[PDB]
Amino acid sequence: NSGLHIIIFDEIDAICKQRGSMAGSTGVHDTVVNQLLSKIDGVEQLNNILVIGMTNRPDLIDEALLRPGRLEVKMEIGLPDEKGRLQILHIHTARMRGHQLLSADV
């Protein structure tokens, strides 16, 4: 009956690179990954968390983390097409058109 807790990692490819790639760079860069893995899904179980991650280089993250049960839903956001551009231009000119600051020949 618990609530919901949200965590938002930003630029997750800065601390979660592949294990054994650089000897942990003096150790910390490996123990960090091990602790995170053990915490997301371990012997004890949690059912009221949600973790969101973002990155521009998605082929560097550790494989043992991108498996079902840890980070399932992977999504790719790409450039829009004509209808998308029309919708984006419609979103960002509502306030002007509301107060009549936009000419009638646009």
Binding site: S25, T26, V28
Partner: protein, 37 residues
């Protein structure tokens, strides 16, 4: 010439010397309070 490295650090609680013993001056104040009484 490979170079440009880093390191980690630890600490130590070196102020082991006790201080509680010299702070139990209450009894002398009690005796002098009795004297003033």
């Amino acid at each position: 010439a490979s170079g440009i490295i880093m390191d980690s650090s630890i600490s130590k609680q070196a102020l082991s010397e006790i201080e509680t013993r010299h702070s139990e001056i209450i009894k002398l104040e009690n005796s002098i309070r009795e004297l003033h009484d």
